[PDB]
Amino acid sequence: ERIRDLTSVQGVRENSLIGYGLVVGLDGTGDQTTQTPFTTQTLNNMLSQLGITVPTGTNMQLKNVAAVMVTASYPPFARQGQTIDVVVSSMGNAKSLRGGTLLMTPLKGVDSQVYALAQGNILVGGVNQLNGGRITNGAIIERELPTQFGAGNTINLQLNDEDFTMAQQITDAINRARGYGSATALDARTVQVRVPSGNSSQVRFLADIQNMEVNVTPQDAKVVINSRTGSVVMNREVTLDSCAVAQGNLSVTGGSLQSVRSSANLNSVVRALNALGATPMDLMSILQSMQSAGCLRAKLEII
Amino acid sequence: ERIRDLTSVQGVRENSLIGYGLVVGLDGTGDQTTQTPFTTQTLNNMLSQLGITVPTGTNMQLKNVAAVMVTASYPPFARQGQTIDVVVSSMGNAKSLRGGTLLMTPLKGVDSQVYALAQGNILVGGVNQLNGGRITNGAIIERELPTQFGAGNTINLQLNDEDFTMAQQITDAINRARGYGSATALDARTVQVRVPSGNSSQVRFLADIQNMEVNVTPQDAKVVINSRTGSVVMNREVTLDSCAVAQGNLSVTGGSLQSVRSSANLNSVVRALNALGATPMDLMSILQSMQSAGCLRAKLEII
Amino acid sequence: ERIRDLTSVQGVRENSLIGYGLVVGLDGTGDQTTQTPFTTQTLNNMLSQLGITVPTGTNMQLKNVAAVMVTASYPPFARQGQTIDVVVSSMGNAKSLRGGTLLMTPLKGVDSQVYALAQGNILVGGVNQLNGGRITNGAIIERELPTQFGAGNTINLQLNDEDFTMAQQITDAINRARGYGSATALDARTVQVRVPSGNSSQVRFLADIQNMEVNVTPQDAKVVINSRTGSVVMNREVTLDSCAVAQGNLSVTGGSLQSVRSSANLNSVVRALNALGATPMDLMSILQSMQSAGCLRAKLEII
Amino acid sequence: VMLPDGTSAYTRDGSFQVDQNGQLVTAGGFQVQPAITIPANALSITIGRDGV
Amino acid sequence: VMLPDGTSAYTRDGSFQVDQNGQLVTAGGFQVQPAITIPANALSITIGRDGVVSVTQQGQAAPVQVGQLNLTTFMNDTGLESIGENLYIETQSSGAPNESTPGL
Amino acid sequence: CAWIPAKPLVQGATTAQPIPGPVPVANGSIFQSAQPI
């Protein structure tokens, strides 16, 4: 299952669909509709379409209706009649969407064409979000996308993470179980494979390819710091050099300057960094300072 | 039962029907009708149709009537006279729909044509939703849709989830119990089967096909995180690499940087992640940071 | 009794009838009639018809009269003189319909023609609904519908739920006890049977057909979630795959990530899901997340 | 005078005003049954000795 | 009115104020069901005889309403439990609090 | 003197017909961008 988990097929991709709708059946937790004119305007549009023309000059003050935006993913090779999941998010001053029902909503693409029609019952968790829900199989595909799959004798596998070693390894793995010249790497992120002419032939070839297992090679040393959530993650290839670290309210347990032992593997790094007795908030600053000095032999990314 | 649970037949699909109606018989828990003019307007329309013309200039302040939207699904091969379930959702400032009765409601399609007529008694749970109910067999089909089923010698089975391996597996399964060239995969999501010319012949063929069992192949490794409900779900094909994790108020039980053991199967992953002693809210951030670093060898989806 | 409980006969269907009436004899629990002008207007109409012309300019403030809507079902092959049950629902600001009597009410069809005449005593339960009641044999059929039953040699049995396997099974069952070519399936929802020419002959044939028993075949795996009532129902064909589940305030009983054992039958699924110790409100989110991930091998419907 | 709930009250305050649909109402907005609708093109309103 | 615990209390003190997110609240800040949101464009707020809350705005000859102020009626007003902070709760006596629009 | 032919100030055409757009490529994407400037 390595090749499918590492790469993606060229032309097999997911698009994004968006639309506007109304959610009805709320228990008095909808829009105020005095500060969100589009809710009442679109309700009047729906009624006018259905055969009820409400007078232009009138005051409608609803409480069970909310104006929402619906987002979905158009899956690869989607055919009309299939169903997809949608996400429903409130748009103006609505308290909750607990037990609402999404009315008929056309999901447009980037090209402003309807690719799906959405309508269903929203499932809201019930510290849980109240203005956001999900409808499983809530939208039906109405339009299909032409594709070039099955045409030509080349298929590109696109690596999720760029690596010359991994690209070469996938090339050598495809060229071991599937013939001599069945794959050629084009760059650090693309492996071009030669496929038989046809549609089912390429499907069979890619089915074979996808479940093959490749031995993942060492992949860069990096320390990911998320300051907004206060988390630090170090992969296996992170090392350290011997150097001294000082920080506020931290001391040898006896001065404030603690020596960090050079470290070869990740267990040594973890032990050396835990010897400092540093909170992760302090550990982030320690890692940044060590990266500046040169003790930390890894790529420090702040996400 | 695998093929029916995995695929859908081309042309065998469900449509969405919508309509507007009134719910009567509520115990003073209907619309205020002073802030929802369409309720009184449509009640006057109904009376005028029935033979009662209420004066244009008058004040009607009802309490047992609510204006509702009715939604239903038009089932495949629906014939006139059959019954379907409908969902009734209040539209404006109604307290409840406890024991109301849905009056005659025409359910329109996307093409604004009446496909069903809805009327019945609403069943409301009774923390339960009060403005939303369901009527079983509450609508009768009045229009039928022409279809191309039974015409031609090709039928497409559309996989619910795109997979070249699964498409090839279904193709090989249909071509084992039903002849040599009875199925051909067209893409990652479509399997074209050759069916005899006729209507009952295709029904028999698809009845045979649908209950066949296919051996499901490994299907991608993915971690689904629902932040709105605070849930994390990992399938069997999720693995881990050895790396260090630090987060606020979490420590080895002795520093704050805990080593996560490489993990091959899902039990190892669960044990390694439970060794951190992390709340799911913290676990979501841990998983996101590990995906950024590269320890988590899976596809992280946020739903 | 399987065929009658699974299918319906073509042309044997129920229509919906609606009408407006007045309910009298209430113990001061009728309309205010100052906010519902149609009650007094229709009472004056009734008096004018009966021979009493109340002056146009006058104030009538009734308390024992309520304006109601009456709904009924027109049964198949209904003949004039037969009686049907009706449902009486209040229409404006009436407190109760406890011991009221429904005056002569013409029940119109969709074509605005009188098909029944309704008049009787309302039975109200007495947390019970007060503005809604039912009258058994409260309406008498006055019009009959022409039908094509007994004409032609084809009769369509329409399956309640679409299934190619079930359609084929009914076709084979009818063709086992009633001759070689007595039934042909037309689609996933229709079985066409060949009947003798005549009226009583078709009645006899359908009497034979209806009580036949068919062996119901596995029917799709689906999990029904009703968030408005907070209920989850899983049928027998629901399975699970091994995967890890995390949710708020749920832990192994010891981390927060609990492994759910792969499950083949429904008992295994129930045991695995009860091992999580999840409230149904949490179980709904768990099931949705597992459907997103891929552990849940069933069709998740939100009703 | 007709109250909003529909019951009739009685007043000796004779200060009446025309509402937005014609009609003579009390200063509090309560209508003065027996009702009196005043047309738009009115040049003068005359209330006589015999209530006309 | 709605207590912070989530249970409803009943008061007769008629002093209300609009808080920073509209919402008519009591002087202690407790929200006054059935929720009344006042827009910022309001020039004058009028609470009617029947509890109708109408709001006038600029460039709109017709006053924009906001909601209904419903009163709770008990069958033994002597029986409510006095919580303290100008609030009464339904005891075993004065049960079944009957909501009603004012005037009827 | 007002009948003398004269050349207006804004010469040329005072309208432009929208040009039909390129045919989308068969790459499996909904977003299709014309020749970018």
From Swiss-Prot, chains A, B, C:
Protein name per the record: Flagellar P-ring protein
Subunit structure: The basal body constitutes a major portion of the flagellar organelle and consists of four rings (L,P,S, and M) mounted on a central rod.
Record carries keyword Signal: yes
Compartments (UniProt record): Periplasm; Bacterial flagellum basal body
Major subcellular site: periplasm
Keyword Hydrolase: no
GO aspect biological process, one term: bacterial-type flagellum-dependent cell motility
Keywords: Bacterial flagellum, Periplasm, Signal
Protein family: Belongs to the FlgI family.
This protein's GO CC annotations: bacterial-type flagellum basal body, distal rod, P ring; outer membrane-bounded periplasmic space
Curated annotation (Swiss-Prot), chain D:
Stated name of the protein: Flagellar basal-body rod protein FlgG
Description of how the protein assembles with itself and partners: The basal body constitutes a major portion of the flagellar organelle and consists of four rings (L,P,S, and M) mounted on a central rod. The rod consists of about 26 subunits of FlgG in the distal portion, and FlgB, FlgC and FlgF are thought to build up the proximal portion of the rod with about 6 subunits each.
Signal peptide stretch: none
Similarity annotation: Belongs to the flagella basal body rod proteins family.
Location in or out of the cell: Bacterial flagellum basal body
From Swiss-Prot, chain F:
Lipid-modified sites (N-palmitoyl cysteine): C1
Lipidation (S-diacylglycerol cysteine): C1
Superkingdom as given in the UniProt entry: Bacteria
Places the protein is found: Cell outer membrane; Bacterial flagellum basal body
Similarity comment text for this entry: Belongs to the FlgH family.
Protein function: Assembles around the rod to form the L-ring and probably protects the motor/basal body from shearing forces during rotation.
Binding partners and assembly: The basal body constitutes a major portion of the flagellar organelle and consists of four rings (L,P,S, and M) mounted on a central rod.
Name of the protein: Flagellar L-ring protein
Organism: Salmonella typhimurium (strain LT2 / SGSC1412 / ATCC 700720)
Top-level taxonomy: Bacteria, Pseudomonadati, Pseudomonadota, Gammaproteobacteria, Enterobacterales
Gene that this polypeptide is encoded by: flgH
Part of the full-length chain shown: 22 to 58 of 232
